[PDB]
Amino acid sequence: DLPVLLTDLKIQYTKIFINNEWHDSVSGKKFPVFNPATEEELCQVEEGDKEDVDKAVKAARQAFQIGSPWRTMDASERGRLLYKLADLIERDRLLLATMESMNGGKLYSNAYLNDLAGCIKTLRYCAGWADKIQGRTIPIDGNFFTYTRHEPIGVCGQIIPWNFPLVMLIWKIGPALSCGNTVVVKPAEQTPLTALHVASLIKEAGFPPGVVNIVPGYGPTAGAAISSHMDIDKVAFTGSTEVGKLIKEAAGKSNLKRVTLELGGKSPCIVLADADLDNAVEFAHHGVFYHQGQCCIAASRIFVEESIYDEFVRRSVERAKKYILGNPLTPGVTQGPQIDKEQYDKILDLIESGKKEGAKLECGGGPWGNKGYFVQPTVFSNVTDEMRIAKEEIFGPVQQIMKFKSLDDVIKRANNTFYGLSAGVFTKDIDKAITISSALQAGTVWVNCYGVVSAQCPFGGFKMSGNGRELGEYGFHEYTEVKTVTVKISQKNS
Amino acid sequence: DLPVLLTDLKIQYTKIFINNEWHDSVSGKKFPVFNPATEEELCQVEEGDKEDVDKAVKAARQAFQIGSPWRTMDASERGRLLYKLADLIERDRLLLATMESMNGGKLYSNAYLNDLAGCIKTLRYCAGWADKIQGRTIPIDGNFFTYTRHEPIGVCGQIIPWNFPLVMLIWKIGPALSCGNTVVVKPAEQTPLTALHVASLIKEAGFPPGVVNIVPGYGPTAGAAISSHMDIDKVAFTGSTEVGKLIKEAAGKSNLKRVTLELGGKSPCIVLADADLDNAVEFAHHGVFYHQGQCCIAASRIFVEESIYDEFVRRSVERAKKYILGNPLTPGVTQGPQIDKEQYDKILDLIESGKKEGAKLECGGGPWGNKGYFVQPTVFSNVTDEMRIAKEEIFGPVQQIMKFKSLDDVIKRANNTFYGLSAGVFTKDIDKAITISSALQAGTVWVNCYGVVSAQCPFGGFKMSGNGRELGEYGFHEYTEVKTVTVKISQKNS
Amino acid sequence: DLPVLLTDLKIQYTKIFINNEWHDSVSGKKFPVFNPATEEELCQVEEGDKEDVDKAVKAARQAFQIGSPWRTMDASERGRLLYKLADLIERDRLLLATMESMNGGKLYSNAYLNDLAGCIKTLRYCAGWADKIQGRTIPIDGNFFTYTRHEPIGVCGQIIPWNFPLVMLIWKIGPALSCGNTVVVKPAEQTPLTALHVASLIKEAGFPPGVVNIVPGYGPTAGAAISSHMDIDKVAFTGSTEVGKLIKEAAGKSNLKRVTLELGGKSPCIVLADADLDNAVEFAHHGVFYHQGQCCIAASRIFVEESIYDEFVRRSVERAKKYILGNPLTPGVTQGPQIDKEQYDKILDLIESGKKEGAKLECGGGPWGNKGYFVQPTVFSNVTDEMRIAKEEIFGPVQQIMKFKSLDDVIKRANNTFYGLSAGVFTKDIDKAITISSALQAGTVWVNCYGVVSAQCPFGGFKMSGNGRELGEYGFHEYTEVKTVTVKISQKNS
Amino acid sequence: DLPVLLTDLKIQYTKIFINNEWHDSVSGKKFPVFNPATEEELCQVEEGDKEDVDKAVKAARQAFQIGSPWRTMDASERGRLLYKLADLIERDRLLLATMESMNGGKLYSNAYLNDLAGCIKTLRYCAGWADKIQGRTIPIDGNFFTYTRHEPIGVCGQIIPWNFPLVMLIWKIGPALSCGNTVVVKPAEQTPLTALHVASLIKEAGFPPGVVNIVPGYGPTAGAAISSHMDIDKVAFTGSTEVGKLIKEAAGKSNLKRVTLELGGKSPCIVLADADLDNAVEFAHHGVFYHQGQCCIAASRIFVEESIYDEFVRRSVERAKKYILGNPLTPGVTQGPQIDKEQYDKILDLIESGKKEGAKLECGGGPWGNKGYFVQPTVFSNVTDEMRIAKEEIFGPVQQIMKFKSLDDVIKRANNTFYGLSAGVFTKDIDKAITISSALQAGTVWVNCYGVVSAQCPFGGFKMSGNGRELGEYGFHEYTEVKTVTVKISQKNS
Ligand SMILES: NC(=O)[C@H]1CC=CN([C@@H]2O[C@H](COP(=O)(O)OP(=O)(O)OC[C@H]3O[C@@H](n4cnc5c(N)ncnc54)[C@H](O)[C@@H]3O)[C@@H](O)[C@H]2O)C1
Ligand SMILES: *C[C@@H]1CN(C(=O)CCCCC)c2cc(O)c3ccccc3c21
Ligand SMILES: [Yb+3]
Ligand SMILES: [Yb+3]
Ligand SMILES: [Yb+3]
Ligand SMILES: [Yb+3]
Ligand SMILES: [Yb+3]
Ligand SMILES: [Yb+3]
């Protein structure tokens, strides 16, 4: 069941959030924010730039100082604060879900039941870790007492994208804060609004000032100032491969800050003849079309064994043909728009490449409507490995389906990409499930399912799909700095 | 006790080591290798360059392929292989120690009793981990079985320096191999020889071909080809901040490979009035002069509380004045040369800056001898925080001593550097030992000792002194890639 | 600040709690419950016996069955349920604290500010673990996939004592439930009431029926039926050494169930001449007198170095002489009664042994008041190691102080006991703090403090003070059963 | 390939081993040791009793004292010592294997290729852990530094059985010693000889005296003195349920020492219609007949789905009919004797119960030969759940095969036993493999294999099959005692 906001959303928070107060931009400049389903302005927002990032970094540094309230509070109280934020987000769930849908072009049903839930669940997960982050005592050679501290790193700059604005903000802040760090978050220029509202809830929960700062703004302005900043200790980023490379170079040129990246993919599924066919069709379908194709882990190469390939394709087309396009707020609407003009153009251009390069068009294949950055859900069959639609992350509702006969051949083809975020394997054979999943060069491999992401599991890429892991026990590693303390003693005993 | 080689060292291995065979350089070119204590050529060595690195990467990739002997062997057998290599290195300890001393300008006493021991101990430590690297089973939300694999990453390029050629080679290969990776090692152009001999012992132990490849050569040639290579998954590096930055940028520009760095420091000691004074003098002394100052963790800023500062300085000068310079092979010689002309020039130039900038010269202060890159052991007192000798890693036998009265002031001064590899605290106060060590922004902090490094402890920098950690349990994290496998099931139970 | 219940406590829950419903005893029998400060009946409570325990075990077994709601729910939802229970306990904190004080003879100030807080903090701690309990994937020899499950054990019987009725109930259920077990709790015959109220809050939070069952009753009746029961998988117990031994034998005779025990102690402090004297006096004082001496970790042997021994004793007597005895509900009252007649008799009898055996009486030494099981706070100096008051856990407000000159001698004396729950070390010497704490045969050692117990730390005894550990990461180990699953595969890869 | 001892085994070590020296029994008494294949005396051995155990405990206590060589040596050197012992055992492998075969009635092929290998592999595994056992640093509430030490426990008494005398000795000592404990081992009265030889190799490796003591002798004499001893901190035991219960009661009555038990089982296999039939037959066959049925994890209930049940039975009988009985030293001999008269009688008596109770005799069913405790390999089909051969651990070469139609029914039947050491599941269905293995109440579950035991995996029972786990990472937990140290500090920082 699914409830709605009984009143019309009114936008309130549109300023830069530093030391728990609302600032105008140093420049006085502001920037517009649109609804992608209508192409209308929703409001203006203060535009942050290097000067404003330099302010937020100073605030974050200050909040991190030895002796400060964020450093001296019990770790269990950092956990409490996060737990409270989660309760507050749950309180304003209608709201947040509506603003997410409206600003992000995200179906309200998903915004409410999935994104909002994932934020809340992820925060509570991270809250639980806070007083469970532990170092070691170590039986070193010689007469010494050695222990390690898993300290927070320091000031972490976090640049996040427009496809899951709330989920991504919580993926970034939840771990960073649980570990004791301070943060300067730069949301996507497209979608600053849910993050500014969450800033209001950070202040209301009671986080010390300067622990979380949020600086709306553009990428090459505000984002670049984060990646090149001499007093930011770590940057985390989700988005394009292009920018991931810039961020990394910038970090090398500046202060050798720590860098973690998540950068999308061209994730493959391998469907064996023995697979439960309908389950495979369903998961691969939802796997590529979710949020209009705008998932890093979109199942954008589906390799099906020859003998079921035609049945797979036909069932996939039947399912793709059942969508209702329109405004993500209206019940029964099952596909929203793409986020903006740039993505719209890229998607249409890649669809054209597919027609031109000889792929078989099964359905969709062009735009839709008079306003909104809508794209008809599109299926291509008989796709081959050198076509643009097989190589490049599309990030639109465009499904590629391809055949294989040889199992060693298809694993090489699945692995033959600089991407490596995720993969899917559909089979009833125990041995093949284990061996295939071992052999795939991907950070997450699903067996007989797809797109299952949980707070308890580390998530990240092999190869150019990123470095590091987020969430799970393992993800917390990227938000600590280990210090070894070795103390001379007269005589050690085991 | 200390034994020696009964015969004169004869050099045998001077070629590139790829797929367990000895190759000449693609170019035919060779490069000379010197003894730093005499400035004489010891031999020529094949000079590897991009072409040769492209060969070694192909070999490493091949050895890493699914189904290969290195991927399918039991993890306990990877451990055995490392254990055997350690026994072989122990067998050829006289030898190795002699070649290390002769090529590296390292006192034979240290080469034998410390470096060689650290290599052997470190290898056995790493051998033990091999079948103890484990993933997780994870109680994810929903009806799924989720587990993680901590796989090896893949082909790791490892560029190492000239100050601890053997120890560094083992620090790099020991973990990488224990975790299951393959490697392409580029030793320092100055000191390839002990590494080629170890390659002979890798072949003799039985490592599959292509698991370890060693490509002697220069930095901007062979080293750069590693850092920019499109099929190397990870690079590890110890050396200069300058190159660390290049390596990182290169990795960003190329294939976003994983990068870990160790980059030296300007490590501080803080000596409180209550410290056991003689213990502090001794450890800080050995801490800065070890291996002619050529330690990443050299104790190159010693802050002493005013009331014991003069006694500290006088005792430090008395100890510095007791060295015998000369050839590192001769018993009773207690200081060898610096590695090469570049380091010699840098050290003399920094000493001059100290005289010029007003520091107080207590002893030494210029070169020594008719041949060899020798520098008299030098002590400067009344040094201040803006002088070059207080800011820049010297990497020579040059000790800085400075005073403090204010404890909060001295921690800010100790932290006021882009470095952060290590620090030392000397006090009898329990509270101060814990609070000071917590407040110092350094990767290792010693209390009432200095320079204690063990295989069981993670080791690495805060800030520009590096990223990542080596050794200990924690260090193994940087040589694995985590994959999450999530399997759909009918019904889960706790 | 300290608030109170605005209305007079009315007792409501007095029945056996099985499958979330309230049962009368099979026998029809009931038993009285007293206030120890007045010796008046507070109510009658259903008296559970073997028959009633057999009912609760059947219910717990049923709730544990594969496919049941408690086994299939997400681990994160077990965490939620515990978190909710913690919020409910916080809601009824006035209440609970009042009933704890009234039934338990516990100062209301402590009941409210310490016990109630510890319950809430401990529950939230345990809630956080629930979805963070993880098994392993293991690189076994041969072509196998091996993983482990850290399953709940099953039905856990938990017998708890009268000194910290609420804290102990939460220490027991929090971990057991977080790990996924079901429980049959037998509270102390003296103090069933706060636990029955918590049962009401378990039902209200939404725990599936049969997950927590609470059977008030006597030790040799209901407690013995738990320890000898053929379908209880684990028993946990806090209380007397005598019963700990019976429980263990019973477990051996019956079904070899798992057993963990916490059994008090005769915990020593060692105060060195260099110790901060006032801090030592204060912590050792509060350490032995807390809750009328009725702490398992009471600091009931204080060894002070000769040269400060007289000053220590005098300051200790000054502090002991400042208590106000009376009803634990009245503000400014700083010592309540002992729990019951048995403890009262034991304490007076041991005090008499101290007078008789030649100890020096500094203050107190007999009973107090016309009603209530009150004992004057008593200090004995010049106590020696063979006197009853040095050997036997008193569990009353009776402080022993003794001298030492020899440090090796005093560690042997501190260790010379079959107990080993905890110890205290007071010194400013870093080396002595580490070496002494290493050498003491005790489960928790405090340095320069005493009595610091936190949810994040494992807690339990060496030697006859118990087996196993509670709380911390480590404590969760005792509430899981590890299963190894080993799956044959065609070919493994690292 | 399989080598043999070129000379006739001569027995040398036959005395009690305390403080690395050979002692006669206090009583002067000696006891005989037999070969089970001939019923001839091999030698006499000193008979240890309470007095001798009291000697070994004093020696172990002494070697454990703070300041002793075993407590102060580096953990890495404990690892070295174990590694050396493993090399020595490998050196004397011919030997040891021959004595194991001759004394134990174990096929020499298995003794050499399996037992001896498992000992060596297990020791090297445990050697690797020694300096990797680590405590924690813990972010406790309040201004404290808290860390934990995972100390050795102390003196561990280890009573081991006659079926795997060498493997069991190494399973016990390897972990105990790696963790830093001292031990008093009581081998089986039947099979002391390989353990005394290993004692000689312990002395030769260089273990400090008193670290390992070995006291041959009887169960109710020497074994009971261990279990009831007031200065033994822990007992570990593998053998009968009967004695496991006595040991536990004894531990409760005496000093509440820690107890771990492994106690055999009645382990079930479940073979589904879709299973690879020949693989299932093979593994279940070897699974019950290994070492003449004398495995704790013998697959002694095989449930086969009706539709393949007859084919399963026929193939199982064909395989059972191919054994050659005789002397375990002669090549091509594939079944040795049972260990002694007691086991021989029990096995024949249980076989008779099977005939009498209506089971179907497929082959074997009585004794063999003129000397030796030989039993013909016996197969029973149509066995039902209430027959003695379905309920009681036989520990002889007697295979039970039974049918099922209902999958929920067969899991209840498999679980319907107080045992729970291990189980086997044979299926090609992924879902069933996971769900069945989850639902089985057994410590190890194999899928599509059986009897796979490795040093890297924890091993132990659910229910009356034991408590605790041996080996793996997890097994080390049972050989440490955790101490929490909590230090007061002026101000903590994260
Ligand atoms: N222990 C420590 O941290 C220290 C140890 C040594 C010096 N440390 C510091 O650096 C200074 C310069 O020494 P150099 O000797 O010039 O080091 P380089 O960093 O260049 O180090 C040489 C190693 O890097 C390879 N290299 C060079 N250029 C390269 C390139 N463009 N791409 C890839 N690789 C390149 C090179 O071939 C060799 O293998 C010293 O004075 C120390 O302060 C700290
Ligand atoms: C170079 C650094 C210093 N060092 C010492 O052993 C110091 C001895 C003097 C004590 C005050 C040392 C040892 C090992 O093993 C290293 C390994 C790797 C890098 C640096 C060192 C050092
Ligand atoms: Yb289906
Ligand atoms: Yb000294
Ligand atoms: Yb010169
Ligand atoms: Yb004080
Ligand atoms: Yb087969
Ligand atoms: Yb006979």
- The answer to whether the Cα torsion of B320, B325, B327, B330 is positive or negative is negative
CA distance D184 to D156: 6
Listing DSSP states for D177-212 in one string gives HHHT-EEEEE--TT--HHHHHHHHHHHHHTPPTTSE
Structure-derived torsion over alpha carbons of residues D416, D417, D423, D424, reported in degrees to the nearest 10: -50
Contacts of A61 (CB under 8 A, 6+ apart): A154, A155, A182, A231
Query: Which residues have a beta carbon within 5 Å of ligand 4, which is an ion?
Result: B 276, 278-279
Q: Which of D11, D5, D32 is nearest to D197 (CA)?
A: D11
Q: State CA A105 to chain mean position distance.
A: 16
Give the catalytic positions of A in this structure: 262, 296
D491 touches chain B (CB under 8 A): yes
A132 touches chain C (CB under 8 A): yes
Ligand 8 centroid to residue D193 C-alpha, Å: 24
- The answer to whether the Cα torsion of B111, B116, B122, B126 is positive or negative is positive
Q: What stretches of D329-451 adopt beta strand conformation (E)?
A: 360-363, 367-368, 374-375, 378-381, 398-404, 422-426, 444-447
**What domains lie within chain D, and their CATH numbers?**
1-264+455-494 (3.40.605.10), 265-454 (3.40.309.10)
Q: Which residues of B18-28 are buried (b: 16+ CB within 10 A; e: fewer)?
A: bbbeebebbee
Active-site option among B262, B362, B470, B478: B262
Listing DSSP states for C405-444 in one string gives S-HHHHHHHHH-SS--SEEEEE-SBHHHHHHHHHHS--SE
Q: Which of C88, C223, C230 is nearest to C159 (CA)?
A: C223
Structure-derived torsion over alpha carbons of residues B297, B300, B302, B303, reported in degrees to the nearest 10: -100
Gap between the terminal Cα atoms of chain B: 59
The pair of structure tokens assigned to B99 is 């070649």
- A117 close to A338: Cβ distance less than 8 angstroms: no
CA distance A444 to A298: 12
| Reported resolution, Å | 1.9
Choose the closest CB to B492 out of C72, C138, C447. Answer: C72
Q: Which of B63, B85, B91, B72 is nearest to B206 (CA)?
A: B85
CA distance C44 to C29: 10
The pair of structure tokens assigned to A255 is 């202060």
D138 touches chain A (CB under 8 A): yes
Neighbour count for residue A146 (Cβ, 10 Å): 25
C5 touches chain B (CB under 8 A): no
Choose the closest CB to B489 out of D83, D129, D435. Answer: D435
Q: Which residues of C415-451 are buried (b: 16+ CB within 10 A; e: fewer)?
A: bebbbbbbbbbbbbbbbbbbbbbbbbbbbbbbbbbbb
Q: Using the beta-carbon criterion (under 8 Å), do D445 and C485 form an inter-chain contact?
A: yes
CA distance B471 to B491: 41
Question: Helices D165-179 and D193-205: crossing angle, nearest 10°?
Answer: 30
Contacts of C340 (CB under 8 A, 6+ apart): C34, C36, C162, C190, C373
Amino acid code (one letter) for D238: T
Active-site option among C119, C126, C156, C296: C296
- B207 close to B173: Cβ distance less than 8 angstroms: no
| Mutational pocket test of ligand 1: of B158, B167, B193, B240, the residue with most ligand atoms within 8 Å of the beta carbon | B240
The strand pairing partners of B234, in sequence order, are: B156, B258
- D434 close to D446: Cβ distance less than 8 angstroms: no
Q: State CA A197 to chain mean position distance.
A: 19
β-pairing, A480-488 vs B444-447, is parallel
Q: Which of C66, D337, D170, B234 is nearest to A462 (CA)?
A: B234
Q: Which of A407, A412, A422 is nearest to A463 (CA)?
A: A422
Those of residues 85-104 in C touching chain A at CB distance below 8 A are: none
Ligand 1 centroid to residue D471 C-alpha, Å: 44
The strand pairing partners of D379, in sequence order, are: D363, D399
The pair of structure tokens assigned to B493 is 């139970």
Amino acid code (one letter) for B83: Y
CA distance B350 to B373: 15
Q: Using the beta-carbon criterion (under 8 Å), do B454 and A247 form an inter-chain contact?
A: no
Q: Is B129 helix (H, G, I), strand (E, B) or coil?
A: helix
Q: State CA A10 to chain mean position distance.
A: 27
Q: Using the beta-carbon criterion (under 8 Å), do D147 and A137 form an inter-chain contact?
A: yes
Q: Using the beta-carbon criterion (under 8 Å), do B473 and D132 form an inter-chain contact?
A: yes
| Distance in Å, alpha carbon of C148 to nearest chain B alpha carbon | 7
Per DSSP, helices labelled H in D181-324 are 193-205, 224-228, 241-253, 277-293, 306-320
Choose the closest CB to B67 out of C72, C148, C491. Answer: C491
Give me Rg for the CA atoms of chain B. Answer: 23
Atom of ligand 2 nearest to the CA of B238: 19
Q: Which of D45, D25, D67, D78 is nearest to D212 (CA)?
A: D78
Q: Using the beta-carbon criterion (under 8 Å), do B491 and C75 form an inter-chain contact?
A: no
Contacts of A310 (CB under 8 A, 6+ apart): none
CA distance D64 to D62: 5
CA distance D392 to D388: 6
* CA angle centred on C325, ends C323 and C326, rounded to 5°: 150
The pair of structure tokens assigned to D11 is 């027995």
Q: Which of A482, D74, A489 is nearest to B454 (CA)?
A: D74
D220 is in an annotated binding site: yes
B441 is in an annotated binding site: no
Neighbour count for residue C196 (Cβ, 10 Å): 22
D226 is in an annotated binding site: no
CA distance B232 to B212: 14
CA distance C100 to C122: 17
Give me the half-sphere count of Cα atoms (radius 13 Å) on the Cβ side of residue C30.
Answer: 11
Backbone angles phi, psi at A262, to 5 degrees: -125, 130
Ligand 1 centroid to residue A236 C-alpha, Å: 28
* Active site annotation includes C262: yes
The strand pairing partners of B60, in sequence order, are: none
* Active site annotation includes D296: yes
Q: Which residues line ligand 1 (CB under 6 A)?
A: B 159-161, 163, 186, 188-189, 218-220, 223-224, 227, 238-240, 243, 246-247, 262-264, 296, 343, 346, 393, 395
Those of residues 445-464 in D touching chain C at CB distance below 8 A are: 445-449, 452, 454-460, 462-464
User: DSSP class of residue B322?
Assistant: T
Q: Which residues of D277-304 are buried (b: 16+ CB within 10 A; e: fewer)?
A: beebbbbbbebbbbbbbbbbbbbbbbbb
C482 touches chain D (CB under 8 A): yes
